[PDB]
């Protein structure tokens, strides 16, 4: 049940893709560490909540 | 369960009011909530289901207005009618159990047992 | 199969359930179940309000007592239900309303009790009045609400010309309207004969010359309950048993919304 | 294993 | 999936089927659902009974015993240089009541030992770290008379050697019952009085008691020779029933326990006062 | 088909037949019919005695009277049957015995009588005692035989320290064992409600932690009968009706034969 | 001899099926932890112990 | 890849498209990039928003409580032989403000316990190493009256047994809310006053408060019997929200907190003085 | 001084609504407490700064630009449904970002009218009517 | 392994 993923390598040694291994030891998902691989989303629901969303090169009020 | 004599007849209203209003003091108010009009006869017993009607997904086992469940009340729909030579007063027994959708969580110690030093 | 019977019924509408172990089958008035106004019979063009479970459910009215002297009781619909929960609110907030009804009359007693109640559902139950004055019964008097009205063994003319009572004077053997009671059986009905049954159950369609109408101005059905055979028990010359009427609106729909109607009932 |  | 049944959409009814009426005299609980007596909507039910499985209900370490043992100079009067405890879940009330919701049981047992100590007197110098011996003595085996007699040689009896300050000691025990299940209740006796007996003491037994020693004892001692200054220690035993199976449900204990049997003595009044028509 | 019913039953075991025209169906404890020890669950290696029809049949115990003051009755099995014919002989001639039981409790009255008996079959029915002294109830007292024992409305502690009675003191609302009676319904049971039924019929499997055991040392099942609702009739404040208990051993088998056990019951 | 099962995931990170791994280190089954994956059963033996179990829409007494 | 959008090469413009002009009245933020109003070059953008993900923002252990407990001789006046704490993130300000940037939340919680101790007085001999019990008491469960009464038997309540000097204790807790999300704000009441009430105390509730106990308490005690000399101990609780999800953003708290609700009392003046035309 | 003490009747103005204040005046009469809200405008009546209130769904009625604002609101809560009598889901706050002004008339006054429609309304748990004491 |  080993889980393998790629690290995002910041500073590189003078030595490519590097990995790390994760194994969950507990039955309750609460006990698990954080994956930290998280998906991002559109600001739109906050920055543009308009019924008729308009395009930036056009007049906001028409 | 009606534990009266077979010659005794009667109609009873049993009800459930979901929380939020004045607890029913009259059959008139009680009628407006969930209710069963029980008719006494060969089938001795009557079941009223209290349907899960709640705001929260799970209520507390402790007393608490935020997670309160409502009121149960019973009234005479007509009255107990007996013939002569028949006892005019009798006992009603009551039973409770959970429907197949019932569930519980967060195991805790009960207040119902203890031991002194 | 299993053990099913004419006598044992369960009726469930909204959050209300009625059980009866001693019924005498049940009547569907004129062979017609309640239904909604169909597009090809529609008249008000506005999208209707259909409150469903909040209004189409069992409202129990105040119990009456049946005794050796009782001449009879009567109720009008929708009037009896005018103050019943959300049905009443919908009725008064809309110019128009139509509704069918399940009527359940309840009266239990004992194997040694005796008597028989005639339960009648009358379309347009126009009643007779007080006076020399024709068609003079006042609105407040024509409409008792939940309370209902009563029957009389004979006609006492309201004599006080100076301050007229403006009430109905419904004589029992004339069905309160100038015809003979024995022929009232042509109306949808059941009989509660105490040796035979606890109750009556009559399902009523909306009956009127129009697909929908003003519920505040006009009553569609009248429920008349009369002692076809008087109450009797052992030798006790003052016996008294309860009669309880429970009614449910069915397929209720409303049109013409605006501010609430507040009728003067004084 | 589940190599992601 | 272990989610409960979804609520079904149910409409009005005018029929000869009457789910609301029943007869409890038969011995059965009426199997009704809300849709049998009221109009219901469709609910996709996600709730589950995962935390009320027998394993889950008992899956917790409960305090069943506090064994007190002293380490001090062997004087010549009754001391606590070693102590013994009959293994039972009954010296405590909390776990006892949970197990007693059932007549019979089967399980493996986890024992976890928390050991605390302290100084008795204001001061006679100090103490070097103590090692505790917890020896299990099965029914029949020689019991200790002295804190350092030959029995503590433990050549066949299981012993734990606990070092003070170390993570709390832990062992697992198998299903060790003489029967196919542990009897939480025994309506009987270990002996029958017979007409042919000499005294009537011969056939006398305790009601509801099975074997005399039943499961044996845990003998506890501090292996360390005594300091000048005295150290008092307490061993707290936590037991957990694991891989549990239970048979025949019983009503919960409603009044306070009076020893190992079902006997009651006082506070036989569990129910509060409340008016019949008072919410 | 034809006319068969829940209420009308015939039970036949050996040369004994019971008829009942007013039953309320029948209970099979824990869903398990009585069965014999299977080879893969066997423990004593010796060929068993299976007396069959001579022991597996209906033994009627002495009748008790139910009156307005009756707090309840209790019996233990096999003890109640220890002197019943060949069952008793087999029980005492063998170190080991197992047996299931059909229990039939009988109590008829009239359409005008009132009251309700709770009939409970309890595995390992350990009862509470007399004294300050724990687990002290004597064998002779724990075992009433056919006679049975009784319940009490309250706990009277046996005070005479000098010569202790060594009896049980079973308080009714505590099911004689420190728990509340209302929860006794989790045990296999039926209710004899006089308006509804004459009798109770409970079939019992052998229940124990072992496949077989000493019947003389240990009782497997306890039968507790309590008035859930008190007996009442017309106005006669001293009504009394009989309750009769009839029991049949089922699938009885015995192991370990030798000379007879003669327990001192004095 | 590694044992692999799926956790029932309650609260989910902003990151599907998650697993956990179990290995028994001891010969005696008593030494083992609890699986906690347990099967449920019918209340029937308790709620309906009848010889002739009847259907809820029919009369209990017939 | 999680790198941000590359800047595009943008040249001069003479057109009818006017990105620079807008109307904030609509409720929208103008989506402009530098290339919309100035000439830009091509930049291959490598920067990333990895450290500002919700998980990353909360992925840290914050001090939410200091529970003080004493181990000393049980005298007969108000002592600290055991202590209780209502579980909340609100006794502290730092984490409270971070969580309060959001109306609703969902997460599992990691509790980490740092335990320090010391001697109160100049000298009465010394103390052997202490073991601490931290018992969680869920709303409804019997609360301790004494440091060693039956409640500490913990047969169903979860307890941690911490040994002094050991690595700081740690547990994880699931999403335990009664709702589908934790409400950081509740514009409402647990009770409504009705016209038909006897006193008007009956329908009175605290504004914004939901359940009375809400999540229960942690009960802390030193399991050790007392030494002659007194030892004071402090349990520092650090909580970390893990596997976090949050809904509906809120403005950050700008003035000092005044208890569990949104109330303010003083220092309502967060902004410094600065001249309109002063850089 | 009393935390979380605002009474139900005061927390709930009905149609009438409530008002904002330029500064915090503490209800001083300890003997008979008013039990009201004291919502200071630049703190959005709740301890945060008004300028950041723009992270909430909003519009601006700038008189040179528009007559009105139209905001469609979903049901927002930690639960799929709840007690409407015990709990308010949304708050509508209207503040003068820029003060009213006209020609030179130092006492100008114009009306603001709020019109609201419930959408996709559904109800559960029927019984007798709730009559809250609003006095 | 035994993946269940
Ligand atoms: C009625 C009494 O309680 C019980 O029914 C009951 C109580 C406990 C239980 O566990 C079995 C008891 C015997 C076990 C307990 C402890 N054991 C050991 C063995 C070795 C060591 C070092 N420490 N303990 C091995 C034998 C099984 C049943
Ligand atoms: C408004 C208050 O704060 C919160 O909203 C809030 C705060 C904390 C939070 O965590 C849930 C609180 C209950 C948990 C906290 C601690 N728990 C335990 C359980 C066992 C032990 C030994 N120690 N702690 C188990 C239950 C969830 C929400
Ligand atoms: C999937 O995990 C199978 C491969 C396992 C490799 C060895 C894992 C060693 C750690 C196991 C921990 C067991 C925890 C109970
Ligand atoms: C099955 O278990 C084979 C795979 C083993 C993976 C490595 C396990 C490492 C732990 C072994 C513990 C040995 C205990 C004596």
**HEC-encoded secondary structure of F80-133:** HHCCCHHHHHHHHHEEEEEEEEEEEEECCCCCCEEEEEEEEEEECCCCCECCCC
| DSSP string across chain C | -TT--SS-EEEEETTEEEEESSB---EEGGG----PPPTTT----SPPB--GGGTSS-EEPPPEEEETT---EEEEETGGGTTSHHHHHHHHHEEEEEEEEEEEEE----TTEEEEEEEEEEET-PPPBSSSSTT---HHHH--GGG-EE-BSS------TTS----B--BGGGTTTTS-GGGGGGSSEEEEETTT-SEEEEEE---SSSSSB-TTT---EEEEEEEEEEEEETT-TT-EEEEEEEEEEEEEEEEEE-SPP-----
Asked if residue H54 has its Cβ within 6 Å of ligand 2, the reply is no
Distances (CA, A) of C232 to C24, H165, H228, H244: 21, 91, 91, 75
Give the Å distances, CA to CA, from C109 to C60, C190, C198, C224. 19, 18, 8, 21
Give Cα C59 to chain centroid, integer Å. 12
Of C84, C103, C108, the residue nearest C18 (C-alpha): C103
Q: Is the peptide bond before F78 cis (omega within 30 degrees of 0)?
A: yes
Pairing of strands A3-6, D2-3: parallel
DSSP-derived letter for residue E158 is: -
Cβ proximity of E263 and F129 under 8 Å: yes
Mention every residue, 6+ apart, whose C-beta is less than 8 A from residue I79.
Answer: B55, B56, B57, H179, H180
Residues of A with CB under 8 A from a CB of H: 8, 28-36, 38, 40, 46-50, 53, 56-61
How many whole angstroms separate alpha carbon I111 and alpha carbon I96? 13
- CB count within 10 Å of CB I92 equals 10
**Interface-testing mutation among E9, E10, E12, with chain C (most C C-beta atoms within 10 A):** E12
Asked if the Cβ–Cβ distance from B28 to C62 is below 8 Å, we say yes
Joined tokens for residue E169: 């000691």
- Three-state secondary structure readout of chain H: CCECCCECCECCCCCCCCCCCCCHHHCCCCCCCHHHCCCECCECCCCECHHHCHHHHHCCCEEEEEEEEEECCCCCCCCCCEEEEECCCCCCCHHHHHHCCEEEEEEEEEEEEEEEEEECCCCCCCCCCCEEEEEEECCCCCCCCCCCCHHHHCCCCCEEEEECCCCCEEEEECCCCCCCCEECCCCECCCCCECCCCCCCCCCCCCCCCCCCCCCEEEEEECCCCCCCCEEEEEEEEEEEEEEEEEEECCCECCCCCCCCCCCCCCCCCCCCCCCCCC
Q: Report the gap between the CA of E173 and the closest CA in chain F (Å).
A: 20
Q: How far apart are CA I65 and CA E50, in angstroms?
A: 60
How many domains would you assign to chain G? 1
Q: CA angle, I96 as apex, I94 and I99 as ends, to 5°?
A: 160
Q: Give the whole-angstrom CA distance, residue H116 versus residue H162.
A: 12
Q: CA B87, CA B82: separation in Å to the nearest integer?
A: 7
3-state secondary structure of F203: strand
Q: From A35, which residue of chain D is nearest by alpha-carbon distance?
A: D4
Q: How far apart are CA E128 and CA E142, in angstroms?
A: 31
The answer to whether E264 and E258 have CB atoms below 8 angstroms apart is yes
Rounded to whole angstroms, the Cα distance separating H57 from A57 reads: 35
Domain of residue G48, CATH code: 4.10.80.10
Q: What domains appear along chain E, each with residue ranges and CATH number?
A: 1-279 (2.60.120.20)
Token code pair at residue B42: 């060969």
Closest Cα in chain G to H246: G14
Using the structure block, give the residue that is written with the tokens 């370490």: E61
Burial state string for B40-78 with b = 16 or more CB within 10 A and e = fewer than 16? bbbbbbbbbbbbbbbbbebebbeebbbbbebbbbbbebb
A1 CA: nearest ligand 3 atom: 1
Q: How far is CA F31 from CA F204, G53, G59, in A?
A: 9, 11, 22
Q: Do G10 and H245 touch (CB under 8 A)?
A: no
Q: Which two structure tokens, joined as six digits, stand for H9?
A: 């090469």
Backbone breaks in chain G after residues (C–N over 2.5 Å): 15
Distance I4 CA to ligand 2 centre (A): 22
Question: Is G33 close to ligand 3, i.e. is its CB under 6 Å away?
Answer: no
Is the shortest distance between the CB of H88 and ligand 2 below 6 Å?
yes
Question: Any idea what DSSP says for residue A3?
Answer: E
What percent helix, strand, coil does chain I show, rounded to 5? 10, 5, 85
Question: Which residue(s) pair with H67 in the sheet?
Answer: H235
Sheet holding H217-222, edge to edge: H82-86, H217-222, H131-137, H159-163
Beta bridge partners of F77: F221
| CA-wise closest residue to F121 among F208, F251, F28 | F28
Task: Give the distance, in angstroms, between the CA of residue H173 and the centroid of all CA atoms in the same chain.
Answer: 14
Q: How far apart are CA F237 and CA C3, in angstroms?
A: 39
How would you classify the pairing of strands F113-123 and F221-233? antiparallel
| Residue among G4, G7, G36 minimizing CB distance to A29 | G7
Whose CA is closest to I45, among H92, H24, H273, H187? Answer: H187
Q: What is residue E108's three-state secondary structure?
A: strand
Alpha carbon H37 to its chain centroid, in Å, reads 43
Contacts of residue B58 in chain H, CB cutoff 8 Å?
A: 178
Q: Which residues of G fall within a CB distance of 8 Å from C3?
A: 58-59, 62
| Closest ligand relative to D3 C-alpha | 3
Tallying the residues shown for chain A, one arrives at 62
Looking at residue G50, what DSSP letter applies?
B
Which residues form ligand 1's pocket by a CB distance below 6 Å?
A: E 87-90, 109, 111, 134, 136, 158-160, 171, 173, 176, 182, 215, 218
- Pairwise CA distance, residues H160 & H170, whole Å: 9
Give first-to-last CA distance, chain G, whole Å.
59
Chains touching J by CB (3 or more pairs below 8 Å): G
Q: Give break positions in chain H: residue before each, C–N beyond 2.5 Å.
A: none
- Going by C-alpha positions, the residue among G58, C54, I127 that lies closest to residue B50 is I127
Q: In whole angstroms, what is the distance from residue B89 CA to residue G2 CA?
A: 70
Q: Which helix or strand (DSSP H or E) is residue I11 part of?
A: helix I8-11
The nearest alpha carbon in chain G to A33 belongs to G13
8-state DSSP, E128: P
Give the three-class secondary structure for E180: coil
Task: Point out which residues pair with E188 in neighbouring strands.
Answer: F218
Contact H72, H230 (CB under 8 A): yes
Task: Please tell me if residue B55 touches chain F, with a CB cutoff of 8 Å.
Answer: no
Dmax (CA) of chain G: 60
The rounded distance, in Å, linking the Cα atoms of I130 and H193 is 10
* CATH number for F116: 2.60.120.20
User: For C3, phi and psi rounded to 5 degrees?
Assistant: 170, 30
Contact of G56 with chain F, judged by CB distance below 8 Å, is answered with no
Q: Which residue out of E109, E134, E171 has the highest number of ligand 1 atoms within 8 Å of its CB and is therefore the one to mutate?
A: E109
Does an H or E element contain B31, and which? helix B27-31
Contact (CB, 8 A) for F143 and F83? no
| 3-state SS, residue E54 | helix
Instruction: Verify whether the Cβ–Cβ distance E179 to F209 is below 8 Å.
Output: yes
Given resolution (angstroms): 2.8
CA–CA distances in Å: residue E181 to residues B8, B49, E175: 50, 38, 9
User: What's the structural domain count of chain C?
Assistant: 1
Q: Kindly list the residues from chain B whose CB atom is less than 8 angstroms away from the CB atom of residue C241.
A: 78-79, 81
Q: Do A49 and I55 touch (CB under 8 A)?
A: no
Q: Which of C88, C94, C102, C95 is nearest to C34 (CA)?
A: C102
With CB atoms and an 8 Å threshold, state whether I128 touches B29. yes
Could you give the CA distance from residue F126 to residue E263 in angstroms, rounded to a whole number? 9
The chains found to touch I (3+ Cβ pairs under 8 angstroms) are A, B, C, H
Give dist(CA F71, CA C172) in Å, integer: 57
Q: Suggest the residue from G7, G8, G12, G13 to mutate for an interface test with chain H (most H CBs closer than 10 A).
A: G13
Judge whether F170 and F144 are in contact, CB under 8 Å: no
Ligand 3 neighbourhood includes A23 CB (under 6 angstroms):
yes
B40 part of contact set with chain F, CB < 8 Å:
no
Q: How far is the CA of E239 from the centre of ligand 3 (A)?
A: 28
Rounded to the nearest angstrom, the minimum Cα separation between C193 and chain E is: 21
> Is F171 strand, coil or helix?
strand
What is the domain extent for residue C220?
1-266
Determine phi and psi for H137, rounding to 5 degrees. -110, 100
Ligand 4 atom with the smallest distance to the CA of G25 is 14
Output DSSP code: residue E219.
E
**Rg of chain F, C-alpha, whole Å:** 19
User: Which residue carries 């209130």 as its tokens?
Assistant: I53
Task: Give Rg (Cα) of chain C.
Answer: 19
| CA angle at C215 for the pair C210 and C218, rounded to the nearest 5° | 70
Q: How many residues does chain H have?
A: 279
Q: How many angstroms separate the Cα of I103 from the Cα of each of I61, I63, I106, I107, I108? A: 19, 14, 9, 11, 9
Q: Is I53 helix (H, G, I), strand (E, B) or coil?
A: helix
Nearest-neighbour CA in chain B from I78: distance (Å):
9
CA distance G3 to C133: 97
Rounded CA-CA distance F126/E187 in Å is 5
DSSP codes joined into one string, C31-62: G----PPPTTT----SPPB--GGGTSS-EEPP
State the Cα torsion F177-F181-F185-F190 to the nearest 10°.
100
Mutate to test the interface with B, among E18, E47, E99 (most CBs of B within 10 A): E47
| Residues whose beta carbon lies within 6 Å of some atom of ligand 4 | G 1-2, 23, 25
Distance CA C150, CA C144 (A): 10
Backbone angles phi, psi at C231, to 5 degrees: -70, 135
Taking CA atoms, what residue in B is nearest to G44? B100
Assigned token pair, G33: 């932890």
Contact B39 C112 (CB under 8 A): no
Question: Which chain F residues contact residue B2 at CB under 8 A?
Answer: 195
Cβ within 8 Å, pair I59-H27: yes
* Cβ contacts of F48 within 8 Å, gap of 6 or more: F37, F253, F254, F255
Using a CB-CB cut-off of 8 Å, the residues of chain G touching C8 are 59
Among candidate residues H181, E232, G59, E155, the one with its CA nearest the CA of residue F7? G59
How many Å apart are CA I99 and CA I93, to the nearest integer?
A: 16
Q: Which residue reads 């899956």 in tokens?
A: E59
Name the residue with the closest Cα to ligand 4, atom 15.
Answer: G25
If we measure between CA atoms, which residue out of E74, E125, E113 comes closest to residue E234?
E113
Asked, as a colleague might, if the bond just before E189 is cis with ω within 30 of 0, I would say no
Largest CA distance in chain A: 60
Contacts for H214 with CB less than 8 Å, ≥ 6 apart: H86, H87, H88, H139
How deeply is G40 buried, as exposed, middle or buried, from its count of CB atoms within 10 A (0-12, 13-18, 19+)? Answer: exposed
Q: Is B60 close to H142, i.e. CB distance below 8 A?
A: no
Closest CA relative to residue H174, chosen from H158, H198, H156 = H158
Nearest residue to E72 via CA among E232, E271, E238: E232
Give the strands of the sheet with F113-123, arranged side by side.
F149-150, F73-77, F221-233, F113-123, F189-193
H186 to chain G, minimum CA–CA distance in Å?
22
Single out the residue of H65, H69, H13, H52 nearest to residue H36, CA to CA: H13
Using CA atoms, how far residue C251 sits from C40, C102, C201, in Å, is 17, 11, 17
Residue C121 near residue C187 (C-beta atoms within 8 A): yes
Least Cα separation, residue H129 to chain G (angstroms) = 30
Residue H271 touches chain A, beta carbons under 8 Å: no
**Chain centre to alpha carbon of residue E101:** 12
Contacts of A17 in chain H (CB under 8 A): none
Residues in chain B within 8 Å Cβ distance of F235: 87
Alpha-carbon torsion C231, C235, C237, C238, what sign? negative
Q: Per residue, what are the HEC states of G1-46?
A: CCEEEECCCCCCCCCCCCEEEECCCCCCHHHCCCCCCCCCCCCHHH
Q: How far is the CA of H64 from the centre of ligand 2 (A)?
A: 11
Ranges of H-type helices in E21-165: 54-58, 94-99
């Amino acid at each position: 049940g080993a889980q393998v993923s790629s690290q995002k390598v910041g500073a590189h040694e003078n030595s490519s893709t590097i990995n790390y291994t994760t194994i969950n030891y507990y039955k309750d998902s609460a006990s698990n560490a954080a994956s930290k691989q998280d998906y991002s989303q559109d600001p739109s629901k906050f920055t543009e909540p308009l019924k008729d969303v308009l395009i930036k090169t056009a007049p906001a009020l028409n | 369960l009606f534990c009266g004599s077979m010659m005794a007849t009667g109609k009873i209203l049993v009800a459930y009011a979901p929380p939020g209003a004045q607890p029913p003091t009259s059959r008139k108010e009680a009628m407006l909530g969930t209710h069963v009009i029980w008719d006494l006869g060969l089938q001795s017993s009557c079941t009223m289901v209290v349907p899960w009607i709640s705001n929260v997904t799970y209520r507390q086992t402790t007393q608490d207005s935020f997670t309160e469940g409502g009121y149960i009340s019973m009234f005479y729909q007509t009255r107990i009618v007996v013939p002569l030579s028949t006892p005019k007063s009798m006992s009603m027994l009551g039973f409770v159990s959970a429907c197949n959708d019932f569930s519980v969580r967060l195991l805790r110690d009960t207040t119902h047992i203890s031991q002194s030093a | 199969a299993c053990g099913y019977s004419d006598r044992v019924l369960q009726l469930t509408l909204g959050n209300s359930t009625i059980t009866t172990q001693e019924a005498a089958n049940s009547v569907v008035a004129y062979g017609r179940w309640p239904e909604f106004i169909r597009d090809d019979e529609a008249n008000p063009v506005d999208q209707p309000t259909e409150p469903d479970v909040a209004t189409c459910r069992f409202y129990t009215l105040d119990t009456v007592m049946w005794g050796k002297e009782s001449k009879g009781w009567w109720w009008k619909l929708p009037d009896a239900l005018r103050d019943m929960g959300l049905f009443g609110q919908n009725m008064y907030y809309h110019y128009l309303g139509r509704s069918g009804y399940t009527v359940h009359v309840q009266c239990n007693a004992s194997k040694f009790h005796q008597g028989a109640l005639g339960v009648f559902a009358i379309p347009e139950y126009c009643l007779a009045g007080d006076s020399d004055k024709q068609r003079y019964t006042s609105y407040a008097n024509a409409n008792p609400g939940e309370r209902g009205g009563k029957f009389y063994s004979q006609f006492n003319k309201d004599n006080a010309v100076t301050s007229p009572k403006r009430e109905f004077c419904p004589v029992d053997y004339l069905l309160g309207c100038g015809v003979l009671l024995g022929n009232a059986f042509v109306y949808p009905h059941q009989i509660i004969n105490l040796r035979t049954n606890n109750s009556a159950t009559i399902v009523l369609p909306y009956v009127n010359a129009l697909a929908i109408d003003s519920m505040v101005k006009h009553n569609n059905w009248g429920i008349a309950i009369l002692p076809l055979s008087p109450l009797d028990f052992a030798q006790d010359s003052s016996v008294e048993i309860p009669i309880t009427v429970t009614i449910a609106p069915m397929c209720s729909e409303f049109n013409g919304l605006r501010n609430v109607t507040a009728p003067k009932f004084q | 294993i589940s190599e992601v | 999936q272990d989610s409960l049944p979804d609520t079904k959409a149910s409409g009005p009814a005018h029929s000869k089927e009457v789910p609301a009426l029943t007869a409890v005299e038969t011995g059965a609980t009426n199997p009704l659902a809300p849709s049998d007596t009221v109009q219901t909507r469709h609910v996709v039910q996600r709730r589950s009974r995962s935390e009320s499985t027998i394993e889950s209900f008992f899956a917790r370490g409960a305090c069943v015993a506090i064994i007190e043992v002293d380490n001090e100079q062997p004087t010549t009067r009754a001391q606590k240089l070693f102590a013994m405890w009959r293994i039972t879940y009954k010296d405590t009330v909390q776990l006892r009541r949970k197990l007693e919701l059932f007549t019979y049981s089967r399980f493996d047992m986890e024992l976890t030992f928390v050991v605390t100590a302290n100084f008795t007197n204001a001061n006679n110098g100090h103490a070097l770290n103590q090692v505790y011996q917890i020896m299990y003595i099965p029914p029949g085996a020689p019991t200790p008379k002295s804190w350092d007699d030959y029995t503590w040689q433990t050549s066949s009896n299981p012993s734990i050697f606990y070092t003070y300050g170390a993570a709390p000691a832990r062992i697992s025990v198998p299903y060790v019952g003489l029967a196919n299940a542990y009897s939480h209740f025994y309506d009987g006796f270990a002996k029958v009085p017979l007409k042919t007996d000499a005294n009537d003491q011969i056939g006398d037994s305790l009601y509801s008691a099975m074997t005399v020693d039943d499961f044996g004892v845990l003998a506890v001692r501090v292996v360390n020779d005594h300091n000048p200054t005295k150290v008092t220690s307490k061993v707290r035993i936590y037991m957990k029933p694991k891989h549990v199976r239970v048979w025949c449900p019983r009503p919960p204990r409603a009044v306070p326990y009076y020893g190992p049997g079902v006997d009651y003595r006082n506070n036989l009044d569990p129910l509060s006062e409340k008016g019949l028509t008072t919410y």
